Amino acid sequence: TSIAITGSGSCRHLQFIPVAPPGIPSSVTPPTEVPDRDPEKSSEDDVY
Amino acid sequence: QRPELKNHIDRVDAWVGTYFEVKIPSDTFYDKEDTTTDKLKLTLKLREQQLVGEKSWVQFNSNSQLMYGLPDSSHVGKHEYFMHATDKGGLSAVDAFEIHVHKRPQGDKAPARFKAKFVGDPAPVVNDIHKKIALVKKLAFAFGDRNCSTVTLQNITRG
Numbered sequence A: 001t002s003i004a005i006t007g008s009g010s011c012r013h014l015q016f017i018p019v020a021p022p023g024i025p026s027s028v029t030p031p032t033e034v035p036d037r038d039p040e041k042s043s044e045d046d047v048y
Numbered sequence B: 001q002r003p004e005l006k007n008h009i010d011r012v013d014a015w016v017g018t019y020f021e022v023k024i025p026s027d028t029f030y031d032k033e034d035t036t037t038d039k040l041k042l043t044l045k046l047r048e049q050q051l052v053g054e055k056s057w058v059q060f061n062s063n064s065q066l067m068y069g070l071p072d073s074s075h076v077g078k079h080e081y082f083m084h085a086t087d088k089g090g091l092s093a094v095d096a097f098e099i100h101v102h103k104r105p106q107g108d109k110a111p112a113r114f115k116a117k118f119v120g121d122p123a124p125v126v127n128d129i130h131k132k133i134a135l136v137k138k139l140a141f142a143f144g145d146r147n148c149s150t151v152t153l154q155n156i157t158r159g
């Protein structure tokens, strides 16, 4: 009745049975890079 | 006279979903009155001298002197069988052998996975090993292949 030839293993990104798939995946949102910097400080008590 | 034995069958290597077929060597058994295996009746038996059932995953044809089968994962591991060699003199020589059935070595990471849905109940097809081997050899012939063992069915589901 039906034949479904599908990829796997090293063919993960490949499907070979034409089902007419219109699937268009979205794009990964760019996350803001958050580098952490801890330089030394002179005392803010110098102000007082 | 009673037939005699020279060479044993060490073990039979089989894999789940794979069809194996073994022809007995011509020097497996000897008799002073026959001298050949092909001219002597050969049967396959269980521990208490019972034959293989029709539904068993391994069968063996005497006229073709050929054993064959296809195992399932519920029958992985060891099994034992006896070869009985009976001459025209009504005397039987016995050899024993062991069969190791392994899981499919490729397992889950196969680069290709063929899938198909058919019509009709899968209950008679699964329940019949004859239907299973006919299906396997029919796929092999559909590809034009000779060695039907190149097919490894992995899973059948009632739909």
Ligand SMILES: *[C@@H]1O[C@H](CO)[C@@H](O[C@@H]2O[C@H](CO)[C@@H](O[C@@H]3O[C@H](CO)[C@@H](O)[C@H](O)[C@@H]3O)[C@H](O)[C@H]2NC(C)=O)[C@H](O)[C@H]1NC(C)=O
Pocket (backbone or CB within 6 Å): B140, B143, B144, B145, B149, B150, B151, B152
């Ligand atoms: C699994 O897929 C492979 C495909 O790679 C199948 O093996 C292929 O079998 C055919 C025979 O039907 C080979 O054809 C060859 O043609 C050349 C032409 O000159 C000839 O020289 C060879 O003697 C042979 O006839 C084909 O090469 C071979 N593919 C290989 C070896 O990579 C195999 O049957 C499939 N098994 C299944 C579906 O169970």
Ligand SMILES: *[C@@H]1O[C@H](CO)[C@@H](O[C@@H]2O[C@H](CO)[C@@H](O[C@@H]3O[C@H](CO)[C@@H](O)[C@H](O)[C@@H]3O)[C@H](O)[C@H]2NC(C)=O)[C@H](O)[C@H]1NC(C)=O
Pocket (backbone or CB within 6 Å): B155, B156, B157
């Ligand atoms: C190959 O076919 C078999 C059988 O159709 C599939 O195994 C089945 O998987 C489902 C999904 O988990 C199981 O359903 C549930 O299983 C749990 C235990 O895991 C059970 O407690 C539930 O009551 C329910 O039955 C089902 O039992 C299981 N059948 C078995 C193990 O015989 C399998 O997913 C298929 N694999 C592929 C790659 O198609």
Ligand SMILES: *[C@@H]1O[C@H](CO)[C@@H](O)[C@H](O)[C@H]1NC(C)=O
Pocket (backbone or CB within 6 Å): B146, B147, B149, B150
């Ligand atoms: C068929 O495949 C089996 C793999 O189990 C291999 O041993 C055998 O040589 C193949 N047949 C031929 C004619 O090459």
